Amino acid sequence: TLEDDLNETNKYYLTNQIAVIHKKPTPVQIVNAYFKQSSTTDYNGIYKGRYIDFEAKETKNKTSFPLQNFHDHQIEHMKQVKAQDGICFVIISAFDQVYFLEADKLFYFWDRKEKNGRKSIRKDELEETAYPISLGYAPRIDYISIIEQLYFS
Amino acid sequence: TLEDDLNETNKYYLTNQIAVIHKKPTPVQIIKEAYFKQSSTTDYNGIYKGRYIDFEAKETKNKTSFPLQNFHDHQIEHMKQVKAQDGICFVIISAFDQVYFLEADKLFYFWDRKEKNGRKSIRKDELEETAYPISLGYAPRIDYISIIEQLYFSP
């Protein structure tokens, strides 16, 4: 489970003073209390004076990543963060790998979704556009090292 | 009221592409019912001009002081970490018929003036002397981004 792996990852980064990144709690309501969806991605925080923002999804699908794993609110939020020069992306656990997919690249797949029915990102499409994250003992999913590479030279 | 005003303030910043700032949902431990747990984090964060913004907001109807019971230790330690990570971090205080922008710099002092000495609350004059009065308006209601601009971007 990616959520567990990221929680442990983010804990590791916190306790080692590498970054301060947290998952946002599930929005609920009043009174009982129902689940609301969010209008925002689940993960944000700070690395080296930069705003970091991402969503994380997994699939057991061996052939493609169903884009309905995201919703339009999340995508809208992402484009607003990009407009402010934020470091913004998704983490996809699929095909026995974990991928760092830049928000730009996600927007392309999202845009082309209904014109016509390309509703999935294929394994080969993902290998082509995303960066493999290094998996380890501690941290489990080393995405900060991808951020360091892409944004901090 | 302060939360509602901050809600509208943040929507205004979003709509106008000034900043992308949101209040975090309050944590709930779900008998599949409801028990509020307190977070290890402050309630507001987001982005403005490529930088990470993070703040707490508190309203006191006290006329003399601002009690420090309003912030938990976990929130404080989170704020120090954000500051040390080169974030922009602060508190918005609704007190004394005014609204104040208090740098986390300044809040750490009054907090540590209990963990070295022993009190403490913040006192009209201590606050009025250290904090920045925030312009109240129509849109945005609470213009804290203006104070952020002065202090951290282009004085």
> Chain B residues with CB inside 8 Å of A28's CB?
25, 28, 30, 34
Q: How far is B30 from chain A (nearest CA, A)?
A: 9
| A–B CB contacts, 8 A cutoff, strictly below | 84
Asked if B24 lies within 8 A of A25 by C-beta distance, the reply is yes
For residue B89, give both structure tokens. 């971090």
**DSSP structure class, residue A46:** E
Mutation target for A interface from B16, B18, B20, B75: give the one with most A CBs within 10 A. Answer: B20
- How many angstroms separate the most distant Cα atoms in chain B? 55
**DSSP structure class, residue B17:** T
Question: Going by C-beta distance under 8 Å and a sequence separation of 6 or more, which residues neighbour residue A13?
Answer: A19, A20, A21, A139, A144
CA B143, CA B9: separation in Å to the nearest integer? 7
CA B5, CA B141: separation in Å to the nearest integer? 6
Identify the H or E element spanning B46: strand B44-48
Give buried/exposed letters for A1-27 (b at 16+ CB in 10 A, else e). ebeebbeebbebbbeeebbbbbebbeb
Tokens 């809208």 correspond to A76
User: What are the backbone dihedrals phi and psi of residue B36, each rounded to the nearest 5 degrees, phi first?
Assistant: -70, 125
> β-strands A120-122, B51-59: how paired?
unpaired
CA B50, CA A51: separation in Å to the nearest integer? 6
CA B93, CA B134: separation in Å to the nearest integer? 9
> Chain B residues with CB inside 8 Å of A14's CB?
81
Candidates B108, B22, B98, B11; CA nearest to B61 is: B98
Asked if A77 lies within 8 A of B39 by C-beta distance, the reply is no
**Strand runs labelled E in chain A:** 20-23, 43-47, 50-58, 64-66, 87-94, 97-102, 120-122, 131-132
Candidates B56, B50, B43; CA nearest to B91 is: B56
From the options 1.10.10.10, 3.40.1350.10, 3.40.50.2300, 3.90.1150.10, give the CATH code of B1-155: 3.40.1350.10
Question: Going by C-beta distance under 8 Å and a sequence separation of 6 or more, which residues neighbour residue A89?
Answer: A53, A54, A100, A101, A102, A103, A106
Asked if A51 lies within 8 A of B47 by C-beta distance, the reply is yes
Asked if A32 lies within 8 A of B34 by C-beta distance, the reply is yes
Identify residues of B whose CB sits under 8 angstroms from chain A CBs: 14, 17, 19-20, 22, 24-28, 30, 33-34, 39-41, 45-54, 78, 81-82, 84-87
For residue B13, give both structure tokens. 């910043």
CATH level 2 (architecture), domain A1-153: 3-Layer(aba) Sandwich (3.40)
Asked if A77 lies within 8 A of B19 by C-beta distance, the reply is no
Residue of A14, A46, A84 lying closest to B48 (CB–CB): A84
- Going from the C-alpha of B54 to that of each of A55, A151, B76, B78, B83, the distances in angstroms are 19, 22, 12, 10, 9
Q: Facing residues of B22 across strands?
A: B45
CA A3, CA A55: separation in Å to the nearest integer? 10
CA B3, CA B42: separation in Å to the nearest integer? 13
> Chain A residues with CB inside 8 Å of B12's CB?
none
Q: What is the resolution of this structure in A?
A: 2.2
CA A59, CA A56: separation in Å to the nearest integer? 11
CB atoms within 10 A of CB A150: 13
